[PDB]
């Protein structure tokens, strides 16, 4: 477990009316890499989702502090807002 | 010559009408009037018909919802057949 | 307005219907005349020699 700051600057590469979706993907890929786990194994608590969609699908925040934990028999990460 | 009553119409809905409203349901000849249905039914089961409602069905037959008097019991009249 | 597809939309009028006398969907309910058997127009049945080849 640990607290990490995820940069969402790369969501700007995606069309603006769809940032939220892309942001949510970036968050999954980030945790997957930094916690050495498969993207399939990263579970995002709705809190994170609501944070990214707070201002609608087009106005995603540039960053997001996320608390994630790693464990189990297949390897995984459970993450939430902070 | 055609007969008025064809056979009892027995389905889940017909049961509820029988158990909860003292009504009997029949498939009758589509040329039959409510009055003819009321009479035919009384003479065949020895009961008192209080009301008859009809419907020309999408099966090509006529359906009659016959309510019996509180003196008669649909559940019993139907159990003997 | 296009005489094709766009003009096909107002066609919800019933004219030709199942005929009482011959069974064909040709009884014009507006004219009360069957275009197939002649019911409503003729006691005799509608029929013409041109409905088949001349020598047959």
């Amino acid at each position: 477990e640990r607290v990490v700051t995820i940069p969402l600057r790369d969501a700007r590469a995606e069309p603006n009316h769809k940032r939220a979706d892309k942001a949510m993907i970036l968050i999954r890929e980030h945790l997957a890499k930094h916690f050495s786990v498969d993207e399939d194994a990263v579970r995002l608590d709705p809190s994170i989702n609501e944070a990214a969609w707070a201002r609608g699908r087009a106005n995603t925040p540039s960053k997001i502090r996320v608390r994630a934990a790693r464990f189990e028999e297949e390897g995984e990460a459970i993450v939430e807002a902070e | 010559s055609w007969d008025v009553i064809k056979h009892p119409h027995v389905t889940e809905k017909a049961m509820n009408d029988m158990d909860f409203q003292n009504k009997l349901q029949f498939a009758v000849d589509d040329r039959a009037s409510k009055g003819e249905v009321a009479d035919a039914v009384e003479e065949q089961y020895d009961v008192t018909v209080e009301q008859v409602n009809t419907q020309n069905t999408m099966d090509g037959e006529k359906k009659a919802v016959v309510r019996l008097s509180e003196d008669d019991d649909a559940q019993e009249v139907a159990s003997r057949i | 307005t296009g005489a094709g597809t766009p003009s096909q939309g107002k066609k919800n009028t019933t004219t030709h219907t199942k005929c009482r006398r011959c069974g064909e969907k040709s009884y014009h309910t507006k004219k009360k005349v069957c275009s197939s058997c002649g019911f409503g127009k003729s006691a005799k049945r509608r029929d013409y020699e041109w409905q088949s080849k001349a020598g047959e």
Binding site: - | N56 | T14, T17
Partner: protein, 46 residues
């Protein structure tokens, strides 16, 4: 639309003709309903 008693009878019949060849008939004949009619793809008479 407003259907009459006779029209209702005819449509009832068309619905009935729209059933499948019973399974038992396949066994009895050692082996299709060519009169299958969909309400959308087909058109009835009248």
């Amino acid at each position: 639309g407003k259907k009459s008693k006779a029209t209702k009878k005819r449509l009832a019949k068309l619905d009935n003709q729209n059933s499948r060849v019973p399974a038992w008939v396949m066994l009895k004949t050692d082996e299709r309903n060519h009169k299958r009619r969909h309400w959308r793809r087909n058109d009835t008479d009248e």
